Structure formats: C-alpha cells, structure tokens
C-alpha cells in the first residue's frame, strides 16, 4: 500500500513522537499534507518485514546501525541532499549514514548512554563498576538499591562488555572486517562475568526491562540507572534530583558505549519520496523542528551545526558527549542485525543462568562471525553437523530434540536432547522418503510439548533440508516450490540432490491429492 499524498512516519516508542507530530502538523498547516507519526512495537524488526512487501512507513527513524542492512535489502531510497544542505550537519554524522558511498538516510542526533544517578540517594556516584556491590549492600539496608538498567536489550550491557576489550567488528584499514568479531575474547568475558556476578549475588534481577528500570529510578527506589538522553524528560516530570555523568570504569578502563546516530530513511516503496525530502530537509532538520522534538524527549547532541551554541550549554549533553568519545560509533554493515540478535541471546541467557558466560559468548561469536542453526519455524531449526557438535549453540536456541539425518554423524549429547536418527546417505540411491512420516510425527510431537527440534545433516544442504521441506509441505499443505523458496530464503545454501527433489515431488503429489 502506502498512500500517495500523505506521509506516515515510524519512530521508536522511547523517542519524542509527540514533538515530531508537532513538526508534522506544521507541515500539514503549511502544505495540507497529513503526517501520521506512529511508534510500533519491535519497530526495528517490524520495518524490514512490512517494507519487504512494499508496505510500511514513508519515513523510518532508527539509529544508523540498522540502516546498512535496510539498504542492502533494497528497502531504502538513496537520499540526494544539496551540498548546501550537507553542510548544515556535522561531516561525521553523514559518514554514519553512508553505505557503499551512497547517502541512505538523514542524520538527526548523536546518542550515547550515560550513568544517571539520584543526587539525594547517592551524592557521589562511583567511579568504578567494582564499587557497586558494596554500595548496593549499604543501600539495601535502607531499602533501596544501587543500580537498575534494562537487561533485556544488549545495548545497555555493551558499555561494560566492551570496556576491557569487547567489540563487534574490528575496523581494519577503512573497511570493517566481518570475520574479526570480539564477542568472546578475554575482555567481553570479563565484562559479562561481572554482570552475571552482580545478578547471582542479588544486586540486580535478570527480569529488569526498560520500564521497570525507569519506574524504579523515577520513583526513587534505585540510586542509578543507565539510559540515554530521551529518558531525561520522564525524570524531570518526576520528583527526582538527578545527574548525568561518566559511566564507571571496569578493570581501570572506561565503559565504551556504542554510539548511535538517530537517522531518518525513506522507504524505497514510498510514492512520496519528494514529500519526505521536503518534510525532513526543511521542517524537521531546522532549529525550530528539532526543538519541537527535543522539548518532548531530548535527542542528545543534534547533527545540526547551528546547535553547538544551545547544546554543550547543558551538562547532560556534555556527559553524553564524554561517554560518546570514550565509546565507538556503531558500524552500519548488514551484519549488525545478526550481531545484535546474537549478543541479546547471550546476555539474556547468561543473566538467567540458562548458559554460562563462556557458553553464551562462544555461541554468539560463531553466530555473528559465521552463522548457525537457521530458524524455519519457532520450534524447528536447520543446520549442519558442525552445529550439532556445538552444545553452546544448541542450548543458546533452547533446542530440546535433534533429528540427525545422516549415517556417520554421532549423537554428541545423548544425555541432554531427544535424538531421532535418520541414517541415510546423501546420494541418488538413498530412500529418505521412507522417513518423512516418521520425522513429521517426531517434529509434531516435540512441538506439541513446546520443545524445539534441530534438524541437521552433514552439510545442512540436502538431507536435512529435504526433511524440513517434507514437514512444511504436509503440515501446511503447500507445493514443493513454495516450501523450497521459504527455506532457501532462510538458508541460502540448501540444495537437495536431484533424487531427493524427485522424492519430494512425488511426496507433493500424495499430500495434495485434490
């Protein structure tokens, strides 16, 4: 869809959508172009889904890190600002939205996490992470706690993971090196270990999310939080006397927060690209437009040069910029998506005791630098014998059962999962179709118990793909070509051998007998 003559805009629920909506009604007042600002849930996930099929907003707002992958998938329109426009914003904020040398979004404002603290509860914030257990013990005796922050989003734990040496993708020369990932190095392990100790010793609760941590701080229950400039408005409205300061050090090194550039891309499918350009360039990216958003929820340090006067006259912006410089600005490469999903899983699982730090981080390193079991359905995964040997990678996903589709691959962890053997070779003589019904019943029974099956073969290319297609075709009554494109979209190297294709083709005829 996406209607001509209107603008729809998506922005995250923590940003100043009301103040953006006010810029939008200025636009409407002047142009008669209705502007609808929306803040959908899981916006960063939801946008590629809708935009893939030509739907979605006209303009999408997110930090720059997701935008390279949006562009790579053909979801974004190149932006072509005049040189006189490009000069109104800091050169480096343009760099953050530049992907293969094309400008793919408008930068708006620079974001970094800071340590926020209640000045009444804690006149002097700690300089180190190592101090925080002792403060929490003092504070707990008065019925408060030292620190609460969102443990469900890895962005909030990253400054500590990276302080001693963690990193996403190493920056070599002038390219990012997508095989050089620093998620399971000695630094990352040290940082995550410290966070896990905080929890196991009951200084934090692993269930804390954004809203719990904001409520606790803004009601005076907790002495410190970790959050960005958008959060300051709700503290103001509260009765809390707060400061924004340098994040504490860890092992004597500063916390290294990922620095995000809030950005606005134009949907490639929008028929209103010029309207979006006019709204963004001459209504939002002006001192008056940025001020309407900023009054609702602070943007941080806005990309707009003309604001270095007004900004930096705020100590909380100064604090943001100090944490920003101690950090690294996020890469925008298409792999950021898999990286974040991998670190999110590691953090939640280590924080919950479902995985040790070493198992959690190792699993995330492989998934980020190289890949892992591919989700087909929520209870059904597809992969290789290499994966079947990485217990950390099965556990990370919550695997409860495996279908080993091979004649020579051992069942490595028979203690810990339910195993179904299909002992066929990947050649023109194997009758894998003899096992389709057996395997579907196994999958179904494991699913009906809420578990997850990992189907693998030697390569994850032919034998296990063939089993996974047979499940889709019978379970949802779809043809082979439909099932094949669904899986191929998720695991691009699948290639059943010609005899397996025919056996699936014959199985198609039996399952859709009209």
């Amino acid at each position: 869809k996406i209607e001509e003559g209107k603008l729809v805009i998506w922005i995250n629920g923590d940003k100043g959508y009301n103040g953006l909506a006010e810029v939008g009604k200025k636009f409407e007042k002047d142009t008669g172009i209705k502007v609808t600002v929306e803040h959908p849930d899981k916006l960063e996930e939801k946008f590629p889904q809708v935009a893939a099929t030509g739907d979605g907003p006209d303009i999408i707002f997110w930090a720059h890190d997701r935008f390279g992958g949006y562009a790579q998938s053909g979801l974004l329109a190149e932006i072509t600002p005049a040189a006189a426009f490009q000069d109104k914003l800091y050169p480096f904020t343009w760099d953050a939205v530049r992907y293969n040398g094309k400008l793919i979004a408008y930068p708006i404002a620079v974001e970094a996490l800071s340590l926020i603290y209640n000045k009444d509860l804690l006149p002097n914030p700690p300089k180190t992470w190592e101090e925080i257990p002792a403060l929490d013990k003092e504070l707990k005796a008065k019925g408060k706690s030292a620190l609460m922050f969102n443990l469900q989003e890895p962005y909030f734990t990253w400054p500590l993971i990276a302080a001693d040496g963690g990193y996403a993708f190493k920056y070599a020369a002038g390219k990012y090196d997508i095989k050089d990932v620093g998620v399971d190095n000695a630094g990352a392990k040290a940082g995550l270990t410290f966070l896990v100790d905080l929890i196991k010793n009951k200084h934090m609760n692993a269930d804390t999310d954004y809203s719990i941590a904001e409520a606790a701080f803004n009601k005076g229950e907790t002495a410190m939080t970790i959050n960005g400039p958008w959060a300051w408005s709700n503290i103001d409205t509260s009765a809390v006397n707060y400061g924004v300061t340098v994040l504490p050090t860890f092992k004597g090194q500063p916390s290294k927060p990922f620095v995000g550039v809030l950005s606005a891309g134009i949907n490639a499918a929008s028929p209103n690209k010029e309207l979006a350009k006019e709204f963004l360039e001459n209504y939002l990216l002006t001192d008056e437009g940025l001020e309407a958003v900023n009054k609702d929820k602070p943007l941080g340090a806005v990309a707009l040069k003309s604001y270095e006067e007004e900004l930096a006259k705020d100590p909380r912006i100064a604090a943001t910029m100090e944490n920003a410089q101690k950090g690294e600005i996020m890469p925008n490469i298409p792999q950021m998506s898999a990286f974040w999903y991998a670190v999110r899983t590691a953090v939640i699982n280590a924080a919950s005791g479902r995985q040790t730090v070493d198992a959690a981080l190792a699993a995330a390193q492989t998934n980020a630098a190289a890949g892992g079991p591919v989700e087909i359905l929520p209870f059904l995964y597809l992969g290789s014998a290499y994966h079947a040997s990485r217990k950390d990678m099965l556990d990370a996903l919550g695997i409860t059962a495996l279908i080993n589709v091979s004649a020579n691959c051992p069942n490595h962890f028979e203690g810990h999962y339910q195993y179904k053997s299909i002992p066929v070779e990947d050649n023109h003589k194997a009758d894998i179709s003899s096992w389709f019904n057996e395997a579907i019943d196994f999958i179904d029974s494991i699913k009906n118990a809420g578990g997850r099956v990992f189907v693998h073969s030697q390569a994850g290319i032919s034998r296990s793909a063939t089993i996974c297609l047979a499940y889709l075709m019978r379970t949802n009554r779809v043809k082979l070509d439909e099932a094949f494109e669904f899986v191929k979209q998720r695991r691009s190297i699948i290639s059943p051998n010609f005899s397996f294709m025919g056996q699936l083709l014959q199985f198609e005829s039996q399952v859709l007998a009209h």
Partner: protein, 128 residues
C-alpha cells in the same frame, strides 16, 4: 517434588533477606538445605554473602554443604571473605570450609581478604 521446590525457593529468599525465623520454619518443614537457584547458589552462599550469621549457623547445623561451589566457582567462604565477616568465616572454618578452594580468578579466601583490606581476617587465614 513440586512442593519441595517451593520450599527451596522460599529458603533461598529467606537466607538472602536475613529472615532468621522464616529460615527456621522452612528448615522445620523440610526445605532442601542445599536448594540451588539457576546459578547453583545455595542458602549458605547467600547467608555468608549478606552477613546473616545466625542463618549461616542454622544452615550448617542442618547439614549445609560448607564447601558448595556455585555455578561460578564461588564458595561461601569466598563470599564471606569478600566483606571481612569474621564471625561467619570462623564458623565456616569450624565446619570444614576449605581454605585452599579457588574462585574463578584463581584466588583463595586469603587472597580475597588481602585484596579487600580485610587484614584482620588475613592474619587469621594466613596460618592455615
């Protein structure tokens, strides 16, 4: 077995909170004195870490594993040495706490106490 799990969780929370009478009641009703959470932390771990002397002593009378290692390598004596709990460390030792047990950083209770300025505790531990 489901009821025993409930008792255990309350026991961990009571040992953590320093609720002496609650811990006794749960002991009387049959709580696993070595109940664990998903980090392998015991009620003895929590009582030692949080300075609940009376609770420490009840758990040990009831047969708590004095050298229990949580999923992370910490023993109750490591946790008590962290804060210089002379009284708690004394009974843990009385009950056979292992002065040579190492934590995830390779440090013993003596190392932990020196690293935190608990030097009174360190003179005690040094002779063992």
């Amino acid at each position: 077995h489901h009821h025993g799990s409930d008792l255990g969780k309350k026991l961990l929370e009571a040992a953590h909170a320093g609720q002496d009478d609650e811990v006794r009641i749960l002991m009387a009703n049959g709580a696993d004195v070595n109940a664990m959470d998903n980090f392998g932390v015991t009620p003895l771990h929590l009582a030692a870490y949080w300075g609940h002397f009376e609770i420490v002593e009840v758990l040990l009378k009831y047969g708590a594993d004095v050298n229990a290692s949580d999923a992370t390598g910490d023993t109750p004596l490591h946790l008590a040495a962290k804060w210089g709990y002379l009284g708690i460390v004394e009974v843990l030792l009385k009950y056979g706490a292992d002065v040579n047990a190492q934590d995830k950083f390779g440090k013993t209770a003596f190392d932990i106490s020196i690293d935190n300025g608990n030097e009174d505790l360190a003179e005690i531990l040094q002779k063992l």
